[PDB]
């Protein structure tokens, strides 16, 4: 998984090479989960929206299994867990955007490139959204171009 929190328990069902999610944690998607270096990149980056949101999901799963929350909502629990879980400056970094400026990120949806011949995947960047709904997929074409090329660079490491 992301190498955070409950050691070797950041797995959905059996994935030992990473973190596997579940549909009830997703919307309009079934059995969408990643693995290998796609999820392990979070420690290297640790400043991107998906990784911060994923940590909260990890924090939720392992705070529901234990802590015996007696319907108290455990709001006292997050009182001093914001620093270790999410990058408080990252949301502050987003704070510089939505004030009548560039399309922003509300942690709603994410995009990634999938290799549909072996099973390779890449860590996602959240879809930038503005007042007028999501972007039309052409505003940041160059952003995916470098990401698509980056896969070829990682393919050299595999080779």
């Amino acid at each position, epitope marked *: 998984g992301t190498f955070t929190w409950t050691l070797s328990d950041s797995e959905g069902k059996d994935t030992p090479g990473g973190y596997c999610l579940t*549909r*009830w944690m997703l*919307i*309009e*998607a*079934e*059995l969408k989960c990643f693995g290998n270096t796609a999820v392990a990149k979070c420690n290297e980056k640790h400043d991107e929206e998906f990784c911060d949101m994923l940590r909260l999901f990890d924090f939720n799963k392992q705070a529901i299994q234990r802590c015996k929350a007696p319907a108290q909502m455990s709001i006292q629990l997050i009182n001093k867990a914001v620093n270790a879980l999410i990058n408080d400056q990252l949301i502050m970094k987003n704070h510089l955007r939505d004030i009548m400026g560039i399309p922003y990120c509300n942690y709603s949806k994410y995009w990634y490139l999938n290799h549909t011949t072996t099973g390779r995947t890449s860590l996602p960047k959240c879809w930038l959204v503005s007042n007028g709904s999501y972007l039309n997929e052409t505003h940041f074409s160059d952003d995916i171009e470098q990401q698509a090329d980056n896969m070829i660079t990682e393919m050299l490491q595999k080779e």
Partner: antibody
Amino acid sequence: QVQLQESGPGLVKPSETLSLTCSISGVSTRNYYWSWIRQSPGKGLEWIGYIFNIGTTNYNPSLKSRLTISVDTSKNQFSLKITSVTAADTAVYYCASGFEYGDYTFDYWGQGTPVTVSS
Amino acid sequence: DEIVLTQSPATLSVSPGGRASLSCRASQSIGDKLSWYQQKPGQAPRLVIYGAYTRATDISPRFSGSRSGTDFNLTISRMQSGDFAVYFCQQYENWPRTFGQGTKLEIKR
């Protein structure tokens, strides 16, 4: 989100062919479990069948069998082909699928259109 | 290929803001692979509860379900607006994918 529309031959004659055309807009065709469902007055719904990619096309085991549901992977539109229409076949048809991959949801439901047996 | 679907025969009308106890009993081995669907007058049905009793995409938090091996119960805590509609339960452990007769939620006079 996936948007679906359908238009069909409201005029039907007993014991002749019948073909609908469900529409898929803004989404691909492969890796989707397109399904056919109809509702008839006086009886509950019945799962008519599913068409997945080009191979497994199970047609409602032991109930009707002859359904010959086909998918046209050229304009993202699949159709139906009934045989030996009976009086009970008067119903309202719908086409739906799951969360873009799956076989137990049937979330995106189309508008549908009623069909009646007339002579 | 049948799996008897007895879902509160006739009707289960409740007072506004009341509690409903829609049920769907299973006569064959289903386990926890049961989904619920809700259909308004007009339009097409939309799922409400998938899996066993987990709330699906959208859907108000009031909706919930329970599991008892064979006796499956759908519960409404605090109804509001025009929630009066028809409901169905669906089985998907096997591959007949049959549907049930359903039940209509009438409005108290």
